[PDB]
């Protein structure tokens, strides 16, 4: 599990690879490679273990990633669900939360169609 908890794609440029971490998108990819002075274009197979632990150390301390991140988002939802607010209710019934129409669509949230 090289970095950071996840084994990022070798053969790929380090900036693109880093996005294969939960919590690290393209924005944060360009950030960590500056702050550690590593060429963003270089492939993960071509990193130095010096650079790896360099890249590793910064990325794992600056931001919340993978497990602990998922834990929070859930707790945040678990919270809204428990305090019983409207946003909460939508999560409890698995319905859309950001005020979308549910007469049609809402399939991403509802899942594939249930016959009647």
């Amino acid at each position: 599990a090289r970095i950071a908890g996840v084994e990022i794609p070798r053969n790929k440029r380090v900036d693109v690879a880093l996005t294969y971490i939960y919590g690290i998108g393209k924005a944060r990819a360009k950030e960590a490679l500056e702050k550690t002075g590593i060429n963003p274009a270089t492939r993960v197979k071509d990193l130095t273990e010096a650079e790896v632990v360099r890249l590793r150390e910064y990325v794992e301390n600056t931001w919340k990633l993978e497990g602990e991140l998922r834990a929070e988002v859930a707790a945040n939802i678990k919270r809204l669900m428990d305090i019983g607010c409207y946003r909460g209710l939508r999560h409890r019934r698995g319905l859309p939360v950001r005020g979308q129409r549910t007469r049609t669509n809402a399939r991403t949230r509802k899942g594939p169609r249930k016959t009647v």
Partner: protein, 83 residues
Amino acid sequence: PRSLKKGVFVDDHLLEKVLELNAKGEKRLIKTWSRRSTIVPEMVGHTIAVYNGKQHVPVYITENMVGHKLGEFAPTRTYRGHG
């Protein structure tokens, strides 16, 4: 959400009653139509009845539900499911 440069909005007529009850010691039930008012730290521990268009829903405020709006806790539609 509402600009941080602006206020933390409470309808004053709702808020006033809170502070009034805080001073003398709380609490009687407060019937309000102010769904748009933020739950504010001064309100915690009270039970405010929030009109949802039909009924006034009794809402006991807690430490968890501070940042929210009052309407969020008195749902406006009755839905028990389909079929």
